[PDB]
Design an enzyme around this catalytic site. Structure first.
Site, short mmCIF file in Angstrom:
data_model
loop_
_atom_site.label_atom_id
_atom_site.label_comp_id
_atom_site.label_asym_id
_atom_site.label_seq_id
_atom_site.Cartn_x
_atom_site.Cartn_y
_atom_site.Cartn_z
N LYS A 110 0.85 -1.11 0.01
CA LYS A 110 -0.07 0.00 0.05
C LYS A 110 0.69 1.34 0.07
O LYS A 110 0.57 2.12 -0.93
CB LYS A 110 -0.73 -0.13 1.10
CG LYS A 110 -1.83 1.24 1.57
CD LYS A 110 -3.13 1.11 0.74
CE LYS A 110 -4.16 1.80 1.22
NZ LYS A 110 -5.61 1.11 1.19
N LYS B 159 -9.60 -17.18 -16.84
CA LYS B 159 -9.82 -17.60 -15.47
C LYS B 159 -11.03 -16.81 -14.87
O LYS B 159 -10.81 -15.47 -15.03
CB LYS B 159 -8.58 -17.73 -14.51
CG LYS B 159 -9.10 -17.52 -12.99
CD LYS B 159 -7.80 -17.56 -12.10
CE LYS B 159 -8.25 -17.50 -10.77
NZ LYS B 159 -7.14 -18.06 -9.74
N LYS C 152 -13.93 -11.49 -10.74
CA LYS C 152 -14.58 -10.32 -10.74
C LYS C 152 -13.85 -9.08 -11.60
O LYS C 152 -14.60 -8.23 -12.04
CB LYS C 152 -14.96 -9.88 -9.25
CG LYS C 152 -15.64 -10.88 -8.44
CD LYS C 152 -16.36 -10.23 -7.48
CE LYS C 152 -15.36 -9.90 -6.17
NZ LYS C 152 -14.74 -11.23 -5.78
N1 LIG Z 1 -11.82 -18.99 -11.59
C1 LIG Z 1 -11.61 -19.77 -10.46
N2 LIG Z 1 -11.34 -20.82 -10.23
C2 LIG Z 1 -10.81 -21.59 -9.08
N3 LIG Z 1 -11.16 -20.88 -8.08
C3 LIG Z 1 -11.55 -19.65 -8.14
C4 LIG Z 1 -11.64 -18.96 -9.15
N4 LIG Z 1 -12.12 -17.55 -8.86
C5 LIG Z 1 -11.80 -17.44 -7.21
N5 LIG Z 1 -11.55 -18.96 -6.92
C6 LIG Z 1 -11.43 -19.11 -5.40
O1 LIG Z 1 -12.34 -18.45 -4.74
C7 LIG Z 1 -11.28 -17.82 -3.63
C8 LIG Z 1 -11.83 -16.19 -3.73
O2 LIG Z 1 -11.54 -15.48 -4.80
P1 LIG Z 1 -11.91 -14.22 -5.25
O3 LIG Z 1 -10.83 -13.19 -5.07
O4 LIG Z 1 -13.22 -13.79 -4.68
O5 LIG Z 1 -12.11 -14.01 -6.82
P2 LIG Z 1 -12.10 -12.75 -7.80
O6 LIG Z 1 -10.62 -12.79 -8.51
O7 LIG Z 1 -13.16 -12.95 -8.66
O8 LIG Z 1 -12.06 -11.63 -6.90
C9 LIG Z 1 -9.95 -17.81 -4.03
O9 LIG Z 1 -9.21 -18.27 -2.85
C10 LIG Z 1 -9.91 -18.71 -4.98
O10 LIG Z 1 -9.60 -20.05 -4.36
NA NA Z 2 -10.51 -10.72 -8.83
#
Ligand SMILES: Nc1ncnc2c1ncn2[C@@H]1O[C@H](COP(=O)(O)OP(=O)(O)O)[C@@H](O)[C@H]1O
Ligand code: NA
Ligand SMILES: Nc1ncnc2c1ncn2[C@@H]1O[C@H](COP(=O)(O)OP(=O)(O)O)[C@@H](O)[C@H]1O
Ligand SMILES: N[C@@H](Cc1c[nH]c2ccccc12)C(=O)O
Ligand SMILES: N[C@@H](Cc1c[nH]c2ccccc12)C(=O)O
Ligand code: NA
Lengths: 319, 320
Positions: B111, B190, B193
């Site tokens: 940060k 992959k 969000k």
């Molecule tokens: N496309 C994906 N495939 C497998 N696991 C995922 C995926 N996206 C998120 N996860 C799992 O969900 C958890 C939280 O991810 P998150 O930060 O909410 O995803 P994003 O990148 O959408 O913000 C991670 O610890 C990860 O293990």
């Molecule tokens: Na993300």
């Protein structure tokens, strides 16, 4: 204008504490409803010896009560009994820029004199801000070295108020410069860190040792002595009205009486002055259940105010 | 039967990547592990002070995890702020936390490095997190590489405390879960969000239709055989199908005669049916708040009893 004072439980109260702050605090109790708390969460930043910390808290409670704190008029409690201050502490941290805390001189000063460079020591001002802001404090009676902490509290309140609307009172420090500085046994400012104190709640034997330590002139017993610069006179003044001061002064200027006699006299004035408080103090420590009851009574009143404030805070933060 | 503790701090909408990537595994671990899970609402206060939103995120998060399989009977599941002991422990642990430990935390260093100013809250949260872990005698903390350093910090604090006071805390260990099959987003990348390539779990049928429609396909004529090995519809459908379910879909792909538009229509049916019960339960828990409260209150009593027992020991050492 709510007045709130946190009181350190660390160490023995000395006459400098008494005449320099405590007496004024006690005599102010009819003017408004005052808030005073033994700050035992803050005491954990300098020691984690729980058996000692716990006794320090009991002793401080007994000392301030015995010196005139009136739990009926005032709101007097132990910090750790009103646990709401912890949650507000965490909430206030979200509004505190690190910059504000990195600048604080008190952390630097405490580290330089050997205290541990720990998160708790660093975070000290944020917890104190929670103390102050939780009770809508307007005025914070402090020594000069705690002024910046009050200022930090205000800066935090400003940041919160700017985001959430006017929810906190803006506190200001109150230092009284009117008060005489009480010299210690060596002639320097009386303080625990200088080991030059005359303690309030000591045995007569202990008090005798302290008063005997007072540094004086080399003036002969036969010759007139200078009261103006004598530490003994300077301390005796605290216990003497106009005539008594002059009577002592006259003994100084006559000669044929030595500082050893003056010390004997000071022992008498001190033992007599705090006689009543000492008995009350030992009486409270002898039956700790009554002390707990007084502290619980105070906590109940402070907790009500804290719980009302937290409900407003809960709305803003989503709890 | 070692205690496993996970703090949950969801953001935005939950998607099938969160589900098949982490949540299902967590739900399935309940029968054979001693699982403690909490909605880490104190921690969410570091990135937002919008109380209206924060309160709703907590309710939604609790409703979502319950809906997807967290079993309040098998596991201990609560909202962090209902067990207030953690705040007191946090202050105590601060006395045993050297500054350098927190100054080196990447979450704070990163940060400050990108120019931003950091709040005391950001700086201090590894200590509160250490309180979360240590309060419950956690043996195992399942975390993302992200969080490994935080568990090490909690470990250093515990060691310091134990050195001063005796056997107070269990030494916790991070467990990085490995190496779960990635979930592909609507665009081939992959699912995440940040990419806006997600398929959400608790959306309206309209929003799901929209997300599924956006899935990247190949330009193959309607009637012609489709290649299931490169198709994101197929890759995503696999998650909801058993081996013979996939086989029946694959036959449909190799046969031809069905277009990608129809496979997307099919995918909608699969997703809606698979999450139908969870969505209904989710909505019920949000529409009748008292039921969610009863469940969170129960979880909190189980965790609080443990926290109170730890605090009784701590109190003896710190003089409270
Ligand atoms: N496309 C994906 N495939 C497998 N696991 C995922 C995926 N996206 C998120 N996860 C799992 O969900 C958890 C939280 O991810 P998150 O930060 O909410 O995803 P994003 O990148 O959408 O913000 C991670 O610890 C990860 O293990
Ligand atoms: Na993300
Ligand atoms: N020697 C003194 N003379 C006058 N006031 C004093 C003296 N020592 C302490 N005080 C008062 O008591 C408060 C500070 O107490 P404190 O610093 O904690 O004790 P200490 O002197 O041992 O260091 C301040 O209000 C200060 O005005
Ligand atoms: N820091 C104060 C004690 C204290 C803690 N919290 C407070 C709130 C208000 C005033 C003082 C305090 C001291 O050293 O004496
Ligand atoms: N910091 C974790 C959430 C969390 C808070 N306290 C915890 C204790 C253990 C494990 C995780 C946590 C995250 O960002 O996801
Ligand atoms: Na001092």
């Amino acid at each position: 204008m709510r007045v709130l004072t946190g009181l350190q439980p660390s160490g023995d109260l000395h006459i400098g504490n008494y005449f320099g702050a405590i007496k004024q605090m006690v005599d102010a109790q009819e003017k408004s409803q005052m808030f005073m708390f033994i700050a035992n969460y803050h005491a954990m930043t300098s020691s984690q010896d729980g058996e000692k910390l716990k006794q320090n808290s009991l002793k401080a409670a007994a000392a301030f009560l015995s010196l005139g704190i009136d739990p009926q008029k005032s709101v007097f409690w132990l910090q750790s009994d009103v646990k709401e201050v912890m949650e507000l502490y965490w909430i206030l941290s979200q509004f505190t820029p690190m910059g504000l805390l990195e600048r604080a001189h008190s952390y630097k000063d405490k580290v330089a004199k050997g205290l541990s460079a720990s998160h708790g020591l660093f975070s000290y001002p944020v917890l104190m801000a929670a103390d102050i802001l939780l009770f809508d404090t307007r005025i914070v009676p402090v020594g000069k070295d705690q002024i910046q902490h009050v200022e930090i509290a205000r800066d935090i309140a400003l940041k919160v108020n700017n985001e959430w609307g006017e929810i906190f009172t803006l506190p200001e420090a109150r230092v009284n410069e009117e008060v005489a500085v009480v010299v210690g046994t060596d002639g320097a400012k009386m303080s625990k860190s200088y080991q030059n104190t005359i303690d309030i709640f000591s045995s007569e034997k202990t008090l005798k040792k302290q008063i005997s330590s007072i540094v004086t002139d080399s003036t002969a017993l036969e010759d007139p002595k200078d009261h103006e610069n004598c530490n003994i006179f300077k301390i005796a003044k605290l216990f003497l009205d106009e005539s008594g001061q002059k009577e002592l002064q006259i003994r100084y200027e006559k000669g044929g009486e030595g500082y050893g006699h003056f010390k004997i006299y000071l022992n008498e004035l001190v033992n007599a002055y705090f006689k009543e408080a000492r008995e009350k103090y030992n009486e409270l420590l002898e039956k700790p259940s009554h002390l707990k009851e007084i502290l619980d009574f105070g906590a109940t009143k402070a907790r009500k105010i804290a719980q009302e404030k937290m409900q407003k805070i809960y709305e803003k933060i989503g709890l």
